[PDB]
């Protein structure tokens, strides 16, 4: 049983890590590299990378605790303790050397810990389309001159009493298409037909409620980073961002910056920010680029 | 039948105002004050005051285009166009003699634009805890090192695909006690009755719906206020605000200070958004003394 369909030559497997299962998906030969979705979303929004990177580099996409067809965390859904189980996952499949690393939104909170404290695992990085947590992030704006801000929703699934999973419970499909799509530039890759795939998966009732506590543990998040940010990141790193309607444009760069000492950034022009989907093309090749860099 | 129940000595009646039906409850005897509330309540905010102000004015408490028992606009929900229907209202009772104005939360949006194009009109003016529309909203941030933000609805209810209707329907109590809680220091006041008669209202359709309509017009507001700004407001003015969690603190008297020569403000230490009911009596005895100046 699988909510995404696999692509062609990939296997869908899962992994006990620390007493929580972790559902991935896997396929290619070569280093490692590991590819960490974000909210809204699982695995399969990297499907149409995986192939292309297949062919240099050994390719894990897990789901994130919760999320997905991965059990919810044991220990806790701030930062530090999520990317103890994705830092795990990769080193079981690369134990005696570095591996490389994409994250997108999400993602990016759950595996910046494990980065700074395992640098050297880490060969090269990406990062995409959303801010680390850091007291930045109390910056946005609640509203904005245009309407709806990027982040309100920061707030509301944070609310106590349970606020966000009981107003969206039952309509779970409703509201993903709206926050993506309000989130999107181009839009019109987002058919019925996909975001149907994407709502099944969220509205299993312990994933909406994970989806949730990610934002719940944000302010842990932010206080965690605090302190592990003192030591800037040493490996190359790059980050994307979109420059059209819901996108981070030039922050995610300027935030980066104060994190890395090697890093590269790049806007893409009509471009929201779901990356891999508006704008496979120009992600893809970026990505593709920048890793084969490296070992491959 | 009526939503909320009247106090003695007020009678709940309606008047058609360009083509719309407006309720409102009215008694006393006087000079008229009008009393504007916010958004998640109708004229039942003011229940308190009014028996008390209705010792030395004439008060009308109108429910806001299609809140409470009031029809919805016909022309829109952006300031200008709320408070044309608000100034009639008024001027009906009140077409011999200049008005007194008190307003609370949304209630603001929708009078300020009359105020400013009317000040002949306007008597002495009482704004609580609440922005006026003009760009320091935009300033609010978007959540806390400690939880949600004073305003992220701002962005929820103008968001479109009715987000905020789809989503809350079915949930209206539960969604107004969070809402309330969240914006108040003194959750003991608000009853679990209470709750339920303001939820009821809200709850009905068309209402539910124009209390987010509100906010769908509040950046057309924002650019209406832009011109209007252009002309200080000349009348007394008080502002109070919340000094406790869910108040505006120390904004609100900040920001009329931009708009008013000549304001002065309270905030009030252990309230929160919901004044009238947080903190009724002491509220109501700077209100009663600021108006019965004049």
Redesign the interface.
Known sequence: AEEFPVPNGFESAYREVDGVKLHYVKGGQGPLVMLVHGFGQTWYEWHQLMPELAKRFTVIAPDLPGLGQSEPPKTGYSGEQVAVYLHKLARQFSPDRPFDLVAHDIGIWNTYPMVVKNQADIARLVYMDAPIPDAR????????????????H???F????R?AE???AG?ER??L??FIK?HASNTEVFSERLLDLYARSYAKPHSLNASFEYYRA??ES?RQNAELAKTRLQMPTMTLAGGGHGGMGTFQLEQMKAYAEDVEGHVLPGCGHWLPEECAAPMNRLVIDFLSRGRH
């Open positions: 992030i109390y910056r946005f704006p609640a509203f904005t001159a245009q309407g709806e801000s990027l982040v309100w920061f707030s509301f944070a609310a106590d009493d606020l009981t107003l969206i309509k409703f509201f298409e709206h309000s944000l302010n932010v």
